[PDB]
Amino acid sequence: QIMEPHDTLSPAQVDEYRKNGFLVQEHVFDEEEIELLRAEAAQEFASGGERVTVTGIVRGVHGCHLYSEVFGRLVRSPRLLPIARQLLRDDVYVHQFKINAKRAFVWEWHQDYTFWHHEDGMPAPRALSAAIFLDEVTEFNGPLTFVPGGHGSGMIDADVKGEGWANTLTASLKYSLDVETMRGLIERNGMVAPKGPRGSVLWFDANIPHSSVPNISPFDRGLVLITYNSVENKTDVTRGTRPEWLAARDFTPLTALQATSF
Amino acid sequence: QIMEPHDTLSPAQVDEYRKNGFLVQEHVFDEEEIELLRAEAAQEFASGGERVTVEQNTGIVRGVHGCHLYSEVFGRLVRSPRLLPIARQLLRDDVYVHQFKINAKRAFKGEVWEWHQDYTFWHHEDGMPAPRALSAAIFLDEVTEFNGPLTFVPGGHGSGMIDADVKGEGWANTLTASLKYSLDVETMRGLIERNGMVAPKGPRGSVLWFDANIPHSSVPNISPFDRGLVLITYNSVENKTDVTRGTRPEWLAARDFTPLTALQATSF
Ligand SMILES: O=C(O)CCC(=O)C(=O)O
Ligand code: PRO
Ligand code: PRO
Numbered sequence: 160q161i162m163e164p165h166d167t168l169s170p171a172q173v174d175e176y177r178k179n180g181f182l183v184q185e186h187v188f189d190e191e192e193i194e195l196l197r198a199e200a201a202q203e204f205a206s207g208g209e210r211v212t213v214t215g216i217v218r219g220v221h222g223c224h225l226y227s228e229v230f231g232r233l234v235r236s237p238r239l240l241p242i243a244r245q246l247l248r249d250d251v252y253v254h255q256f257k258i259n260a261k262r263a264f265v266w267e268w269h270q271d272y273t274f275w276h277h278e279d280g281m282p283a284p285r286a287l288s289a290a291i292f293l294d295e296v297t298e299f300n301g302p303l304t305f306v307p308g309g310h311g312s313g314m315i316d317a318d319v320k321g322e323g324w325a326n327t328l329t330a331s332l333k334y335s336l337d338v339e340t341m342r343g344l345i346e347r348n349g350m351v352a353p354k355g356p357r358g359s360v361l362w363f364d365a366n367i368p369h370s371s372v373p374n375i376s377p378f379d380r381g382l383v384l385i386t387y388n389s390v391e392n393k394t395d396v397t398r399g400t401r402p403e404w405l406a407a408r409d410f411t412p413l414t415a416l417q418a419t420s421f
Numbered sequence: 422q423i424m425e426p427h428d429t430l431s432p433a434q435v436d437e438y439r440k441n442g443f444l445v446q447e448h449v450f451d452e453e454e455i456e457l458l459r460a461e462a463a464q465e466f467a468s469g470g471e472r473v474t475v476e477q478n479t480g481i482v483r484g485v486h487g488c489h490l491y492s493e494v495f496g497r498l499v500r501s502p503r504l505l506p507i508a509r510q511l512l513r514d515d516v517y518v519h520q521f522k523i524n525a526k527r528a529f530k531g532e533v534w535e536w537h538q539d540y541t542f543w544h545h546e547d548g549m550p551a552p553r554a555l556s557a558a559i560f561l562d563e564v565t566e567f568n569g570p571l572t573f574v575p576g577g578h579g580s581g582m583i584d585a586d587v588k589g590e591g592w593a594n595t596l597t598a599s600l601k602y603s604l605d606v607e608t609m610r611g612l613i614e615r616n617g618m619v620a621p622k623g624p625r626g627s628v629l630w631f632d633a634n635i636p637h638s639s640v641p642n643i644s645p646f647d648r649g650l651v652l653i654t655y656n657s658v659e660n661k662t663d664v665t666r667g668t669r670p671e672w673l674a675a676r677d678f679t680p681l682t683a684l685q686a687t688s689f
């Protein structure tokens with residue numbers, strides 16, 4: 160049995176990711192694969208307990224690669240792992256895994272690294288996220304939106320609206336970026352909401368500012384977001400404040416799935 | 422503590438490797454790193470017992486095999502961030518060590534390596550099912566025209582297995598001056614008349630990457646200079662050898678196919 164030999168990004172793709180802070184690869188996973196991932200997402204939303212977040216409809220579920228065999232395999236996929244290694248220039252592990260159901264009918268502006276630095280003791284922004292598109296992403300179903308090049312600043316200041324971690328994944332975020340700071344970033348660099356078909360992968364930098372608007376449209380915008388971190392960049396578990404299913408503590412380097420008879 | 426971020430080959434470098442079947446990177450390891458490896462090699466030649474091979478005319482050391490299984494230093498080298506990411510890159514897979522050897526090719530007494538493709542050996546002796554493997558040869562000494570450099574047929578890997586005459590049952594003569602698989606003389610001449618021969622040179626600490634199927638040879642060293650090479654053969658995990666058709670011990674042909682991970686920088 161055989162897996163396709165590992166594909167990595169071209170030098171122009173790597174340049175684009177480094178310059179913009181994001182990159183889309185279209186049609187990484189096929190329809191049948193996506194539908195497997197959608198079924199498992201639905202299982203996780205149904206049975207995830209305290210790892211589910213909520214009007215009261217599912218907003219997200221966290222940590223599923225620790226609890227689902229299917230998602231545990233996904234993060235080792237040869238479509239994903241080799242690019243994560245290549246971009247981070249290290250062995251890698253999963254810092255965070257989440258499925259953000261942007262149901263058919265806000266995430267405020269933020270840099271992920273800001274969260275992971277302060278909540279989890281991530282020492283440098285040497286991490287990224289791969290967002291797998293379970294639905295077509297269009298202009299109308301609340302696409303992730305970025306300030307391109309906005310990661311080159313580094314961490315940007317934000318008020319800490321909370322003395323807990325409950326508000327880290329609510330509509331009102333613990334470390335939101337203010338209107339004055341964003342207006343500046345946006346006037347300088349612009350805003351971009353990358354689009355793509357079901358099965359695409361959107362890669363984005365831990366430090367890139369991003370947001371998404373409410374989805375009142377008729378279509379869902381399900382994303383599976385896998386955050387890969389450099390093993391060298393492992394979080395300081397002594398500054399960590401969160402459960403495992405938000406901030407991993409097993410730093411074992413990931414290895415790629417091989418083709419087996421089962 | 423910080424390891425330098427993993428460096429991979431450029432697209433030009435990869436293209437050169439695929440087209441020629443070999444590639445030199447100069448100055449990968451520094452003198453002090455090489456000296457550590459030289460000292461460990463000397464330990465392995467002194468204590469490897471049955472894993473050590475000697476030259477026939479004289480009894481001086483020819484080779485030692487499997488050291489990554491027995492030396493911690495050599496166990497870490499194979500995981501080095503200077504080596505592992507390139508092997509992963511070139512084999513487009515996770516990888517493991519099929520074979521590890523140190524070929525000492527001393528100053529005046531070092532003997533021939535006749536023309537051979539490594540893959541021919543690994544396929545028939547060890548059950549490697551495709552040539553999706555490569556060797557990284559670390560230069561413990563400057564390799565020059567005169568100290569018996571590995572010599573290749575550039576592009577000679579792109580015909581698969583070439584036809585060889587087999588000498589005997591068993592495997593002792595896989596490591597000798599006269600090899601169990603010797604190449605057909607007219608096919609050799611034809612290969613060479615169309616592709617030429619090249620002996621890559623380079624300073625101490627270089628790495629010479631070469632394809633599992635590239636024809637290669639080396640002459641005796643009559644310089645007053647050693648040519649110690651540490652040869653690490655990485656194989657694709659997908660391409661793991663079929664251990665049911667395997668005829669040799671573990672220190673010639675690995676059985677543990679666990680994918681390798683890179684060394685990190687720790688406080689010890
Ligand atoms: O449409 C979505 O929100 C993606 C699919 C999903 O999250 C689910 O199957 O429950
Ligand atoms: O708390 C966290 O880590 C995730 C990622 C940024 C917003 N919510
Ligand atoms: O027997 C082997 O495996 C090595 C490679 C060719 C010569 N000796």
Ligand SMILES: [O]
Pocket residue numbers: 539556652654
């Ligand atoms: O080799």
